[PDB]
């Protein structure tokens, strides 16, 4: 519930080292996950390039008048 930014508050750090770890761990997530997201965006970008009784229409160039 912390990394999903929910943060209920029923169980929270109560000592400063435990508070410091949460602050650091949030900062780590904000600098590690975007690197994975950026690589995912790159791979998604490169990747971008029924029933029965059908008939096929083989043409060389389809224009709106012919269709």
Task: Please select the residue that binds its own copies; options are 3, 7, 23, 26, rule is CB under 8 A.
Answer: 7
Query: Which stretches within 1-67 are classed as H helix?
Result: 16-47
In this structure, is the dihedral angle defined by the CA atoms of residues 4, 9, 22 and 26, taken in order, positive or negative?
Answer: positive
Q: Which of 9, 45, 54, 60 binds its own copies (CB under 8 A)?
A: 9
- x-or-dash string of contact with another protein, 25-44, rule CB under 8 A: -xx--x--------------
Phi, psi of 60 (to 5 degrees): -90, -40
Q: Which residues bind its own copies (CB under 8 A)?
A: 5-9
């Amino acid at each position: 519930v912390t990394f999903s930014t929910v943060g209920y508050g029923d169980v929270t750090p109560k000592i400063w080292p435990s508070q410091l770890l949460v602050v650091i761990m949030i900062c780590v997530a904000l600098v590690v996950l975007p690197l994975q997201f950026e690589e995912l965006v790159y791979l998604w970008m490169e990747r971008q390039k029924q029933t029965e009784k059908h008939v096929v229409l083989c043409v060389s160039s389809l224009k709106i008048d012919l269709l």
